Write a protein that binds this ligand. Structure first.
Ligand SMILES: CC(C)(C)[C@@H]1NC(=O)O[C@@H]2CCC[C@H]2OC/C=C/C(F)(F)c2nc3ccccc3nc2O[C@@H]2C[C@@H](C(=O)N[C@]3(C(=O)NS(=O)(=O)C4(C)CC4)C[C@H]3C(F)F)N(C2)C1=O
Ligand SMILES: [Zn+2]
Length: 200
């Protein structure tokens, strides 16, 4: 538009839940409903206590995941764009932005826990989805892995930004895109943790 006085501001990304991995059972928890999410996106002020490594995040139009690794909350650019994230003292600007990698990052929220970058060199991985499904993935290249059991794309939608983990629970990568044919996801593409470590 040409009328700057009425130009709108995009809201903040908002943490609305988490994938609980602290015990023997993975499960999703919601920490904020849709109305409170809307309010928090506009103010950028989120007073909720943050816990865990994998957050469920939302904008006005999308929901996806974000994963703390080495004190940075990482997610995908196709979800967050250049948006700030809401925090107790207001909006927080991204400290990493790389559209070529489909990658953004903010300082990790106070109270969050960070995953350690994997140095195991192992190819037996586990994808964690927004529904707290743990999906075995065999690593097939620097940024690719195959599902041991393929599943319709619907079961992976909304899990970009989530982690691929090694058998020891280290972060190996961030889920970016799916490889699907006839609607069935047979493989996943992820941002390797080394690419995060280079971006850092
Ligand atoms: C056909 C398909 C499955 C839709 C698509 N496959 C696909 O493109 O595969 C090719 C071949 C193998 C790698 C990939 O190379 C292209 C790179 C794509 C990309 F990822 F780097 C990407 N960079 C962007 C940078 C800037 C702006 C937009 C971008 N858009 C991108 O990709 C787009 C988005 C990405 C996506 O849907 N991700 C997921 C997801 O859950 N999102 S989400 O949470 O619902 C949501 C949309 C709320 C945020 C995990 C997959 C879930 F659904 F399984 N896409 C399309 C796909 O996965
Ligand atoms: Zn490891």
């Amino acid at each position: 538009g040409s009328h700057m006085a009425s130009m709108k501001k995009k809201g903040s990304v908002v943490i609305v839940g988490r994938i609980n991995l602290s015990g023997d059972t993975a499960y999703a928890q919601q920490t904020r409903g849709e109305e409170g999410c809307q309010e928090t996106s506009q103010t950028g002020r989120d007073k909720n206590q943050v816990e865990g490594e994998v957050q469920i995040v939302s904008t006005a139009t999308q929901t996806f995941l974000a994963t703390s690794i080495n004190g940075v909350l990482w997610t995908v650019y196709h979800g967050a764009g250049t948006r700030t994230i809401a925090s107790p003292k207001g909006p927080v600007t991204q400290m990493y932005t790389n559209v070529d990698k489909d990658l953004v990052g903010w300082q990790a929220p106070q109270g969050s826990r960070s995953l350690t970058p994997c140095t195991c060199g192992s190819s037996d991985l586990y994808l964690v989805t927004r529904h707290a499904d743990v999906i075995p993935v065999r690593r097939r290249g620097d940024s690719r892995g195959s599902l041991l059991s393929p599943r319709p794309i619907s079961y992976l939608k909304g899990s970009s930004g989530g982690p691929l983990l090694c058998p020891a629970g280290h972060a190996v990568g961030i889920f970016r895109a799916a490889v699907s044919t006839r609607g069935v996801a047979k493989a996943v593409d992820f941002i390797p943790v080394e690419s995060l470590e280079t971006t850092m």
